[PDB]
Amino acid sequence: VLSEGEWQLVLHVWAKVEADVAGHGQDILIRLFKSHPETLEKFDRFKHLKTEAEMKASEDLKKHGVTVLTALGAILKKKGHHEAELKPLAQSHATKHKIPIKYLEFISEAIIHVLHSRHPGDFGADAQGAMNKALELFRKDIAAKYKELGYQG
């Protein structure tokens, strides 16, 4: 599992995320869309946006970046005991939204990238390794639920 020392690394940087959830949410979703354009097409609500400036100006996008981060934070602060939190999420993502597990890998990379951009002094190698573990645990447990439902990635 993650050790208590790894969790403390993750939650320290996350409490910095929380100082500016909306800005972090925007940078993370813009990175995802720009790096992996296919992901934008999953969003009926956002697929009209074509340029980075248009993405930055959308209030709605910033609102959904808050939704995402707020759910992610709730999961993180359970420290691996996130069975309840994860169940609704993997259900809508598998069945309603149809999000492949690979795209969850992509958003994981975009979170890590942004956290390094914004918080270098608290996001050294040790905190990066810890965060990457925590995101892998999130993926692995969601992947298990997808398997059960018959969408595995």
Ligand code: HEM
């Ligand atoms: C940290 C990773 C993610 C978290 C915590 C997350 C969380 C959420 C939450 C809580 C909602 C709203 C409730 C829902 O229907 O379950 C949501 C909706 C949605 N998510 Fe995710 N999601 C994540 C990754 C993704 C990815 C990678 C995509 C697409 C490539 C995606 C696509 C959607 C879509 C399409 C909606 C519906 C948006 C709308 O029509 O309102 N999510 N997200």
